[PDB]
């Protein structure tokens, strides 16, 4: 909506912000992944000191839950990638809408000689 110049500024802002958002999400997620590795290493430090059978069975189920959490993060990353692709497609659609609006054959105006 609005003038074609506003459409142009909105589209350029969306493109730049989308690229920056992709980068920032990747960076923060990688930091989280490194902390996840530290946590896994900690769980294996506990495995060395386990004494009874109940303790090691609880630790096995804890590590299984940890694996489930990493699985969930994998699914979330897949979902983020799909959303990234959808956002790029939407930006392209907006570009083409602006292009169609400029070149539409339904336009009736032209400069006036005065």
């Amino acid at each position: 909506n609005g003038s074609v110049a506003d459409m142009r500024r909105s589209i350029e802002e969306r493109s730049r912000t989308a690229a920056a958002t992709d980068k920032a999400v990747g960076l923060r997620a990688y930091e989280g992944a490194q902390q996840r590795l530290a946590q896994i290493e900690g769980l294996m430090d506990e495995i060395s000191r386990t004494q009874d059978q109940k303790a090691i069975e609880e630790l096995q189920a804890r590590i299984a839950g940890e694996q489930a959490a990493i699985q969930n993060e994998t699914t979330k990353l897949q979902m983020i990638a799909q959303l990234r692709q959808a956002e790029q497609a939407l930006i392209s659609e907006q570009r083409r809408e602006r292009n169609m609006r400029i070149l539409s054959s339904g336009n009736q105006g032209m400069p006036t000689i005065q």
């Binding site: 169609m100 070149l103 054959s105 009736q108």
Partner: protein, 272 residues
């Protein structure tokens, strides 16, 4: 809608009216009373002096020569009716271009109107081509080239025809404005050639305006109809349509090119 020749023609008409027709009307109106009285008093004085002085033949020489001068001056000062003649030229172009050779009658239409309508059909086809180019993001500049070709053909045909019409109108306006100075040239034998030349140019540009209005109206109407039938559907061959467009454009263009030479040649052929 597409309106380019109507505003341009109105603008040029206003410039010719304010600067070539009104100024001539202002000058003739200012001198008409004073020159009238002066000529009458000169007639009386010269008659008395020649009957009491230098030899003259009153019955034939004086009356006949005075009649010649009087008729020439009357015609020359009747050019002060410039508005009638400029509007006569303004009416001439559309009346002939509308139905002289078209065969299609309308309640009211000017030459600029018909050129604008035909050019609107052509430019609408070009706009549709541009829209198709917009649809295909890549693999779409072919439609852009099609639109450019259509635009150039329609524009160049319309521009040539309208510009020669403008030349005819401007020239006729300037000649009508400068008329009285050249009708006055009949008074003296050495200056008769000036009237002959002015008359020849008037005939030249009148023949020009008739030929352009008639032939240009016919050709531009044909081109407009052809472009109005042009469609980028799946049933019409694009190459055939664009080729027909360019062929019609170029045919009309060169036919119109021959016409100025024809007008000048007929004007020269008539003795004058």
């Amino acid at each position: 809608a597409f309106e380019l020749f109507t505003p341009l023609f109105n603008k040029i008409d206003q410039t010719t009216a304010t600067y070539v027709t009104d100024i001539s009307s202002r000058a003739i109106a200012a001198i008409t009373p004073v020159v009238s009285v002066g000529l009458t008093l000169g007639f009386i004085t010269y008659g008395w002096l020649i009957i009491r002085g230098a030899v003259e033949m009153p019955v034939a020489e004086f009356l006949n020569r005075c009649l010649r001068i009087g008729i020439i001056v009357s015609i020359a000062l009747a050019g002060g009716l410039y508005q009638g003649e400029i509007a006569n030229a303004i009416t001439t172009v559309p009346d002939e271009l509308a139905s002289a050779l078209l065969g299609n009658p309308t309640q009211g239409a000017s030459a600029a109107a018909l050129v604008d309508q035909s050019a609107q059909q052509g430019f609408d086809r070009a706009s549709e081509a541009f829209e198709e180019a917009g649809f295909f993001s890549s693999d779409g500049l072919l439609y852009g080239l099609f639109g450019i070709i259509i635009l150039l053909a329609t524009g160049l045909l319309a521009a040539i025809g309208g510009a020669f019409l403008l030349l005819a109108k401007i020239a006729l306006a300037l000649l009508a404005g400068l008329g009285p100075l050249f009708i006055l040239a009949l008074i003296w034998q050495p200056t008769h050639r000036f009237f002959d030349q002015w008359a020849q140019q008037v005939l030249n540009y009148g023949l020009l305006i008739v030929l352009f209005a008639a032939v240009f109206g016919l050709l531009m109407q044909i081109f407009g109809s052809y472009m109005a039938d042009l469609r980028f559907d799946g049933a019409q061959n694009v190459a055939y349509a664009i080729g027909g467009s360019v062929i019609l454009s170029i045919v009309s263009i060169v036919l119109l090119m021959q016409l100025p030479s024809i007008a000048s040649g007929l004007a020269g052929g008539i003795g004058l």
